[PDB]
Specification:
CATH architecture: 2-Layer Sandwich
Number of strands: 3
Strand order of the largest sheet: 1-2-3
Protein name: Phosphatidylinositol 3-kinase C2 domain-containing subunit gamma
Domain PX: 8-111
Structural class: alpha+beta
Shape: globular
Oligomer: monomer
Family: Belongs to the PI3/PI4-kinase family.
Largest sheet: 3 strands, antiparallel
Helix content: 40-55%
CATH class: Alpha Beta
Function: Generates phosphatidylinositol 3-phosphate (PtdIns3P) and phosphatidylinositol 3,4-bisphosphate (PtdIns(3,4)P2) that act as second messengers. May play a role in SDF1A-stimulated chemotaxis.
Subcellular location: Membrane
Strand content: 15-25%
Order of helices and strands: EEEHHHHH
Number of domains: 1
Number of helices: 5
CATH superfamily: Phox-like domain
Length: 111
Amino acid sequence: NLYFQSMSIERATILGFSKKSSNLYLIQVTHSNNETSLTEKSFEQFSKLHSQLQKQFASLTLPEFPHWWHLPFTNSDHRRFRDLNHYMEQILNVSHEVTNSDCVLSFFLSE
């Protein structure tokens, strides 16, 4: 485990929907060296990431996955953006091992 790296992930934020499809969230990832990259992910892909992290990090306190069944989540784009933003800022601040895990890096740094 390497600490204090450059291309590791610091933050990730929703810019809006992808131009390819509004089923995909356009996410800007800021690396530790302050360079940015973009990825596009569906809600199902966020769900799968969370599921994987729960299995891999059984002893850590992970953040709550968004409550998608609340009506504003279904009806409001901005609600979904806010909830995913809050999820991402928490999931990148659990531990070094979570932030630098293969599933987190693969999620954020893939197209």
